[PDB]
Amino acid sequence: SLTWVGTFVDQRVREIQEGYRLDNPRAVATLARLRRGAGKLWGLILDDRFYADAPPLKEKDMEVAENSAHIALTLYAIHQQSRRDDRMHQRGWGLGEAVRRLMPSSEIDEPLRKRFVQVGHAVTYKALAQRLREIVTLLRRDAIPLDYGLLADQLYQFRTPQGAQRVRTAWGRGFHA
DSSP: OOOHHHHHHHHHHHHHHHHHHTTOHHHHHHHHHHHHHTTOOHHHHOOHHHHHTOOOOOTTHHHHHHHHHHHHHHHHHHHHTTOOSSOSBOTTOOHHHHHHTTSOTTOOOHHHHHHHHHHTTOSSHHHHHHHHHHHHHHHHHTTOOBOHHHHHHHHHHTTSHHHHHHHHHHHHHHHHO
């Protein structure tokens, strides 16, 4: 189940993803602009549907939710690029499960596992986005999908130390599942 952040992102990425599948020019330009924007327009990512269902919010929590949606959409744009055959956003694909497919189910690639572990220990959202980008690049090369609604939720959940621990634990569990 997704909260309001992940529910929006799931619906928005599905829209762009189906448009990219159809080779729709607006969808193609939107994903390209999202990639060119990486590490740096609102109206492409976030529309009134995102704000309309939002629950009461603490002081800087809207900014974090907007940033979480922005990171998720940018990562998806990088993930989907030139992948004509398959959808890179699929519900139910946790980040730990996806990363584990990069190695034999028999084995653990220690340098990759070390890097994956380090993703959850990012001190800022900028570092977290940069670390996730490296992982999604690898997932793209193997054509492994991810659930971007779920990821957006977890990005938002990261704002508190206790939420970050819960996210690291979910990724840890999915990696060994």
